[PDB]
Amino acid sequence: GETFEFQAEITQLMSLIINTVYSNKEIFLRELISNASDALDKIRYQALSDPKQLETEPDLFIRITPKPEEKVLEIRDSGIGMTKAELINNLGTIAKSGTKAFMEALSAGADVSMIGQFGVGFYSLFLVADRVQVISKNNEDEQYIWESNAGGSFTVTLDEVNERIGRGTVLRLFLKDDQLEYLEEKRIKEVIKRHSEFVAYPIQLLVTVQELEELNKTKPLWTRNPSDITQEEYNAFYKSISNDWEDPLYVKHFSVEGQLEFRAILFIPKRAPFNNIKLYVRRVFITDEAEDLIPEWLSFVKGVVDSEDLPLNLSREMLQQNKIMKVIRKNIVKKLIEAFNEIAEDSEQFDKFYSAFAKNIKLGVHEDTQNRAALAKLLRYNSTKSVDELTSLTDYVTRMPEHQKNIYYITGESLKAVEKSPFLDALKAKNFEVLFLTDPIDEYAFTQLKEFEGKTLVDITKDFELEETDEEKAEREKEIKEYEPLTKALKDILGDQVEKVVVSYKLLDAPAAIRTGQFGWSANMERIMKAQALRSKKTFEISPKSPIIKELKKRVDEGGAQDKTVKDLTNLLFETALLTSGFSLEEPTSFASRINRLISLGLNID
Amino acid sequence: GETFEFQAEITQLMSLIINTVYSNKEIFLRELISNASDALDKIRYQALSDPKQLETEPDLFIRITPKPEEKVLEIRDSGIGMTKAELINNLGTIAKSGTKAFMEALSAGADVSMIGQFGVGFYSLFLVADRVQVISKNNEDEQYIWESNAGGSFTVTLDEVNERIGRGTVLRLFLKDDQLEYLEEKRIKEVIKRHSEFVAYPIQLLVTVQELEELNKTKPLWTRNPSDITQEEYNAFYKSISNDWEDPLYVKHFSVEGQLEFRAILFIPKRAPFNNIKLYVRRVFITDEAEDLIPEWLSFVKGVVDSEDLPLNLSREMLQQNKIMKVIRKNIVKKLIEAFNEIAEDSEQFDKFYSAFAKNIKLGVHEDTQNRAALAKLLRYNSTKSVDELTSLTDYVTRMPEHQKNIYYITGESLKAVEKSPFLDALKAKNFEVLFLTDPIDEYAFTQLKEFEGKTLVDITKDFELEETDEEKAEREKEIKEYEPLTKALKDILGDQVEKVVVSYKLLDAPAAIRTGQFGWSANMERIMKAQALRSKKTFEISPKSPIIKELKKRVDEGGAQDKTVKDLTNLLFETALLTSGFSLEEPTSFASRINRLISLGLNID
Amino acid sequence: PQNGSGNSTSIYLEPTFNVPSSELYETFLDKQRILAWTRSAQFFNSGPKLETKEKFELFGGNVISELVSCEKDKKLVFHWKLKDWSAPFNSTIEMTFHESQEFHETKLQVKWTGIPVGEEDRVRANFEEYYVRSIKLTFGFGAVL
Amino acid sequence: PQNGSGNSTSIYLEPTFNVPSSELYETFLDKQRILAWTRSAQFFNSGPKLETKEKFELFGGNVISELVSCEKDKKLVFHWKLKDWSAPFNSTIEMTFHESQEFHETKLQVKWTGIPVGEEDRVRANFEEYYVRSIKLTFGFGAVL
């Protein structure tokens, strides 16, 4: 049949590229800087083979001249310029990118990496300007004027009224009557500090005598090796990409090569607020809203990620759905895991890192399942054998005796409440070290880890058993049946307040305590669950070596198992041990009333 | 001078509309289904003036017949069809939309609202197919075949081997080898459920025995009259926009017809989900990631919003920044505030709503400001006069006596702890009702409201002044200096644990109590801050008419200010008041040691 | 062609609960405890515990389930079906207990078959909220974050 | 045109604190209390409290401030400056206290001037983090969730 080639409606395609492509209208300055940066790379590539190309204009810069009294925003550069044919073929044809043809015509192995590769970015300036008056000047051609008003046609006239420029392009933009905000000083600096901050060429701005201020003093550090970058240069780079007022605590600058080539300079701040990772392609900011690039628990670090093979969107405000994100996501976590190990090699620097980001390290143990063992080696806590200095899980198993097969820990509201807890005297007698957990997020990480180097994590607040000699067990079991009438007597008194009352030999000084049931929320976990603004079984145990419990043993022998006077004490002793174990005290008024009655007895009043 | 019209490079523009736009590849089905919907609207508009247009085929449907044997995804519809001239101009020209031209030729007062308005949605099928064979058939022309390979030209041949369809278009999509996932039943139904679920015309799918299943069975309700829709129809509509299994609790179906006309059917679920509001433009799902659409505290509300005059981009996946979504944000909150008032008019319906979204309503009082007073009418709490049922802030003021000028409340960990708190008896003597705050988010709402109908919110756990007469104030000042040597004696014992010891007459049944102060966090607030996963001052008060404090008054009269016995009872009474006021003990071990001493002497243990 | 429905599919879930198989098995059978983590239940039998071939509605009658086979703390088979589904559509949930005494937990292997192809993600997104998270929050069978 | 710099701008903040105007006034002057919410401070004078015409560096030395004028619990005027800022840029921040007796709070009206146009939003977002929320979370002068 008849074969027809594809066509395009020019009067309707222009409205689509301008109006229905970009979400914001301030990106027009980003593209005109990118076009000026590409033009400066073309004249620079020719300067390496011929130095006479820079005789007209020796300096390479991008100048922005706002004119409020004339409603004109001039953007002048000193690039290669456009000849008479380039103003019609490259600039006058939609989807025609002269920069793309320049990258394909150069020799294989060139160091230049230009930005423009689509051919429609120039038409973005009409979002804020009705008519443009682009003026060009090439070394091999005269000076012309490219005037257009986003209509159906454009006009190219020989420049005979404006000033004679040496080399470059002068883009005169007549801004709209409702887009005059881009004539101010702060608005221009806001767009440059957001999209064109790390341009390799100086961006000059004429501010009010008249002076020129450079808006890109800070140069990108991902174009240099980490071996020739000083520490102070990383501080100025961190204070430029982020609004923080403090220097970064640690810097991780790595570069992945091979199939995927991308560079990233990740910074670790000195404090936590309780995205941050920017994306740069062709030295141009793309987006910072890619939450899939970095995990949520690891989102406390800042920095940028430079790449050149990412499939950018037509609007260049984001990138397409691709399988490269998880590849970069893997290398970011892999390098930050090693970055934390480099901080762990030091003692004073890791003290500031762990005291500022203790939550983030413990959240990764709870959420991530691949680096859970690597993050467990970074945890630091207190213990019975380490009261002042924080000890690690690796140093814990080194001090474990040959017979100890489990890692013991304890949770609580504060450190002073767990250091004198009635559950430590049993393990301290057996020389078993017990870790101290004082933050609400500790138990959320120990519930997922459950094992470190083969050692099972055991919580001493929950019910558990310790190994002992067969001679000692035969002496304890015969003592349990002696206290059997006493244990069953305390069950009818407490009722359903506890699951059961059993004799415990893990309590030396304390008269009694309430344990958990080896399952569900512990004493501290239920306190956290009932305290979240946006969001079990217990066992009562007594110590048979305390004078209080020994006195209760003879009371049931004389027939006082259901005595009224003993109920005022066994109920007070039960609620008192609830405070030591960390359980919530129900009806505190009744607990205080029974205390006030004993205080009255101490004051000899009825 | 020399005027030139804008041009467009075909071989480069075709790539910019395929591999640079449409970041997701599954949207090709969303465009072909929509293009079939516009064709069915054109033949339907002609049926109103000529019923013979539907005599070639009376049924209006969109059929999808997958063929894994030949790797072809066929999409057939019975729309208006395209002639030989329309296959070259409307289909072969970029940015040329024959549907947009049909809308401009509609008669005055038309009701049809077609989708296609750009002219590039057809070319999206090349993301998953290397070549397409569009078979069209119109009533005014023969049956032709539109074939192309996404290159630089297309072929139009007269159909001589395919089926002789009556009317419509058949699109043979030869899917790519790496895009064969769209040949399965599960993947096709996933795209229709996501994008083209609410198409007005039936969408048929050939499921392999060959049988047909209609995918768009749930018709949209925003087109119908809200007064004509039954309750069961809203339940079936809620099961489609959301994967929830529970029926919606309340439905708010409104329509604004001002400058920005849009429909919105907002649903209230039965359980909290701890976005949810979808955006539709002309029966097509646009996006569900609208930030400014709905506030943060209101995210529990579900439903959809259907508008027409929205700035869709080239990809139709997001809205342009035109400063118009804040108007929809105002109307959504305006109608949902009134929606909550209609639920409040019903007794049982509001109990189910308040018990499920208690924290959501109180969260709005914390952050939102313009509707902070409106959300205060929805707050329900318990009190001394409303122990069983809940009461609102409006009914509280109605029961306030003529001499009460402040709203009294109390925070705590649980309801049983605050119902018998010693801070209530001061207001119960004055017959003042005191609200009960049992949730961690309660104090965050009262700290931002601070007033209701002119009545100041006063927390009784904090320091406050209760009105008294001159006959009683002369008695209190006469008794304060009598206990002045005792209050100073209790200050040296506690030291820096409390700022001062003040004789308080707001304590009747309790010997002593502790308040934080007038400013800053309360007793319950600091307990919540020290218990969050992502995350003070005390004033001692004693009762001058209690038998314990009066017995301590004679102790210092005998030179017992530094006595050894009074120090044990003072620290015991101090830490006991920490439990009743809502504080946490510095160390429960030491508090239990003092109790175990009183238990020992209570049993005559030497 | 003829009008009909589509084929079915199957999914596999493996939630871990900090509760022994003796208590977790009674969670899906005790009517007084089923009403806790569901907040909506309709039992048609006066028996306190669920029996074989016993139908009951959940979540306002939208979820229809029936216990078909069950072993002592080891097996649980239910005939799960949604009210929105058509007549021929019916699914079967196969629950297998994998209690591990080393960590004091139980990983409930759920082999869910018979669900439609268009609802394999709907019933899965709600299972981690109405069956997994609802039990871990009402009875506290593990930390939720 | 010669190479230089730009002009300056001004902002206005009024965060509400739950602290008396007398106690909040001592927070910005007591050197031992400044180190609580700043975590890094270097004072050059021997006095225990800040004095007029006294320079001090904050946050590792990048924030250079100087108390130039102050009234009794009502006014606090400083000279805020960043190490990254140029030499002629020397901002002046004024703190005016307004105590609310009926609500028991203090609205600290901040009249900040002398800020560069490029660093306007930088010092505004960090003021809510290094000054507003840092004091509310350290001394308990506000409920932050």
Ligand SMILES: Nc1ncnc2c1ncn2[C@@H]1O[C@H](COP(=O)(O)OP(=O)(O)NP(=O)(O)O)[C@@H](O)[C@H]1O
């Ligand atoms: N300031 C300039 N100086 C010199 N040549 C320029 C300038 N701006 C544009 N050009 C030329 O005009 C062509 C059209 O560029 P443009 O329409 O902006 O798209 P592009 O930059 O080439 N590709 P993209 O940036 O992805 O849209 C460029 O390829 C250059 O050859």
Ligand SMILES: Nc1ncnc2c1ncn2[C@@H]1O[C@H](COP(=O)(O)OP(=O)(O)NP(=O)(O)O)[C@@H](O)[C@H]1O
């Ligand atoms: N299935 C179809 N049946 C009949 N005519 C069709 C069909 N698909 C497309 N057309 C015609 O071809 C034209 C080109 O449409 P298309 O390229 O898909 O973009 P559009 O739908 O017109 N606008 P948009 O959907 O925003 O991209 C339409 O305007 C119709 O006139």
Ligand SMILES: [K+]
């Ligand atoms: K161009």
Ligand SMILES: [K+]
């Ligand atoms: K077209």
Ligand SMILES: [Mg+2]
């Ligand atoms: Mg460009």
Ligand SMILES: [Mg+2]
């Ligand atoms: Mg289309």
